[PDB]
Design a protein around this nucleic acid. Structure first.
Ligand code: NEA
Length: 393
DNA sequence: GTTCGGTGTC
DNA sequence: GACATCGAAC
């Protein structure tokens, strides 16, 4: 893993430390952030680097190198500045997840970190650990994925940061070559409060920050790139979550173990549908992408709503809204399934057209950009629907 | 019950 | 770039 020079230079320009102050790089390896800070600001600081792998630790004689797990590390004194590129990844089984430690080690992480939620992430834990090691008024500058701005797993982290000091977020995007990650820079100071959102422009000279919006009373709410247009559209109709009960499909293991499900086609058997069967405005009932077949009438045994024709919205097609009416009522292995609430009048074909419209695609791309490769529930439930498509009596 | 990807594979 | 994970995780 190597952070591009223009990304490092941009983060160092945001970094601050008092003279003689303690500067720390977690997961430092050879320590590119300590070197860049020293070149820019001088030698009159106490430079420290923390690294877990003895093969990776290679710091110059002017920096103190510590062989330790940063997440379970207990230093004597706190730090004035913390900067760097933390490792990213979910801790779990090797067949599914990239971070592999003993169960007892993961238990030590869960115990240490109050923001740990769901599967969580290594970079979330690094963020909380760094804030806890900061002096009052201390500065943190990290480069992390943009996923923590919107996702539920990071709700406690967002609430934590809003409570501990003031936050600036700088959107970079996919700035790491051969790494599938949309990145942001977080500047945190352990004093004051509020959130500042920034866009960036890339030139040959580096990255230039452009102020987008300020949220002085930010309490840990989902972070979005709002405009005059997005606000206008949102108050034009009811939120989609107010009109529909939104459920997700049964998961692959539920189908695989179910006695009615077959691994091969046959008489009376029908394909279990995935996201590859869902298109803007229609459903492909013929193609099988899951490798699973079952009787259509037996679908209600996994989820009761599989027996009722309903609205299906896509989950893994990037940040966009792809919808279709499932007229036939098939078994689904993926996607959102929207069941109208009591007293809700709807026009299925008109609502599908609105959800697939270019106005809606632009709406979600403005707010959520490419933070995640999904349309999430929290994005979906906030989508505006006017009386022409769905009415609540 | 549903969430998430230094994505996974074409 | 297309076109989406899919199952271990809680
Ligand atoms: N800063 C570069 C990307 S993060 C990758 C580096 O962080 C180190 N690393 C991974 N987990 C760590 C941990 N828990 N504590 C300290 N260093 C870690 C790895 O050895 C690797 O050199």
């Amino acid at each position: 893993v190597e952070t591009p020079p223009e990304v490092v230079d941009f983060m160092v320009s945001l970094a601050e430390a008092p003279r003689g102050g303690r500067v720390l790089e977690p997961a430092c390896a050879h320590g590119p952030f300590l070197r860049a800070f020293r070149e820019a600001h001088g030698t009159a600081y106490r430079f420290v680097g923390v690294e877990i792998d003895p093969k990776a630790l290679d710091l110059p004689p002017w920096a103190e190198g510590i062989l330790a797990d940063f997440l379970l590390w207990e230093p004597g004194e706190a730090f004035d500045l913390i900067l760097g590129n933390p490792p990213y990844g979910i801790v779990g089984e090797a067949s599914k997840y990239p971070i592999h430690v003993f169960k007892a080690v993961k238990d030590l992480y869960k115990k240490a970190f109050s923001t740990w939620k769901g599967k969580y992430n290594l970079y979330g834990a690094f963020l909380e650990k760094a804030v806890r090691l900061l002096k009052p008024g201390g500065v943190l500058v990290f480069v992390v994925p943009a996923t923590w701005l919107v996702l539920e797993d990071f709700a406690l982290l967002r609430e934590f940061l809003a409570r501990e000091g003031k936050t600036s977020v700088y959107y970079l995007g996919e700035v790491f070559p051969q790494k599938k990650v949309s990145a942001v820079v977080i500047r945190f100071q352990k004093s004051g409060k509020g959130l500042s959102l920034w866009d960036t422009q890339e030139s040959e000279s580096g990255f230039t920050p452009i102020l987008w919006a300020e949220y002085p009373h930010w309490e840990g709410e989902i972070i979005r790139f709002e405009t005059e247009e997005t606000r206008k559209l949102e108050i034009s109709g009811m939120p989609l979550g107010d009109l529909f009960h939104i459920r997700f499909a049964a998961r692959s293991p539920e189908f695989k173990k179910h006695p009615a499900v077959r691994k091969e086609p046959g008489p009376g058997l029908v394909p279990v549908l995935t996201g590859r069967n869902l298109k803007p405005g229609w459903v492909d009932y013929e193609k099988n992408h899951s490798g699973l077949w079952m009787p259509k009438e037996r679908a209600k045994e996994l989820r009761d709503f599989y027996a009722t024709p309903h609205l299906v919205v896509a989950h893994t097609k990037g940040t966009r809204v792809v919808a279709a009416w499932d007229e036939r009522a098939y078994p689904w292995r993926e996607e959102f399934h929207l069941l109208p609430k009591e007293g809700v009048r709807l026009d299925p074909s008109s609502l599908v057209q609105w959800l697939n419209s270019e106005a809606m695609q632009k709406h979600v791309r403005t707010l959520y950009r490419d933070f995640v490769p999904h349309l999430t529930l929290r994005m979906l439930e906030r989508l505006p629907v006017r009386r022409e498509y769905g009415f609540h009596t």
